[PDB]
Design a protein around this ligand. Sequence first.
Ligand SMILES: COC[C@H]1N(S(C)(=O)=O)[C@H]2CC[C@]1(O)CC2
Length: 282
Amino acid sequence: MEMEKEFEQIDKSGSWAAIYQDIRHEASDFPSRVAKLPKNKNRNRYRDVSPFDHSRIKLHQEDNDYINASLIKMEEAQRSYILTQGPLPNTVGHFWEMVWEQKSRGVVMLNRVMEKGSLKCAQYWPQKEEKEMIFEDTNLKLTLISEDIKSYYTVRQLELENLTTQETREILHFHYTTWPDFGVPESPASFLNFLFKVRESGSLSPEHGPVVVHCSAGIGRSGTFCLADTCLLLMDKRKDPSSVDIKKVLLEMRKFRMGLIQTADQLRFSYLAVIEGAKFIM
Ligand SMILES: COC[C@H]1N(S(C)(=O)=O)[C@H]2CC[C@]1(O)CC2
């Protein structure tokens, strides 16, 4: 079926939970043996969210190459994304090592450091120009260059230096700051505006490594971001845009990381975002 009318048909019939459970039943199951090794327990935020072995990002280190991060490679859309958990106190150095090694331009952050009164990720970037951060375990230096605070999101320019080689690179930090503590946003307008700002920066384009995107677990809000982006790109590429099937795209993405889209409300919100976004594109 088309999207917008499939949408109204699920609303009127109140069957979002049944649609979402079908997706959960059909989703791929692949091994994640490296994630479950005992030496990696303090590298995982949640025991039930792990990268598959076949798609995990490897750190360029011979001691321990593990990080909780997955490469989502979308062949028809010609887009790639790295989805990862919010960094932990003992993985902030690994996080920036990955950004460096994978040649990423942008980092997309969809959570606040504290939500619901608890810590959802480490304070992994510097908050003042004159107070830079040094990650001694991976030999990197990170400096805040500039910050632009808007009503729904903040954009930061960061300098990452590889202290071994003295090479430097500019990284863009796109921080969506207004996702509610509970539920999903009422309108997708500010989320779509944010997505377009990331696109306009070059961070999603083939001349760079894959964008790094995270929330707390790296599957819920993060899944919504890459699902909406890929669906909108396919609608631009194809002769028949109504042929884009959001449930099929989501199942393809779940071949590369488990659990993408965590609730039926996130599924409905993804439909809403793609539907509204397709009208603005034209
Ligand atoms: C559109 O429905 C939203 C509700 N459904 S429903 C009524 O479709 O089954 C699920 C359970 C509670 C919700 O508010 C979110 C998902």
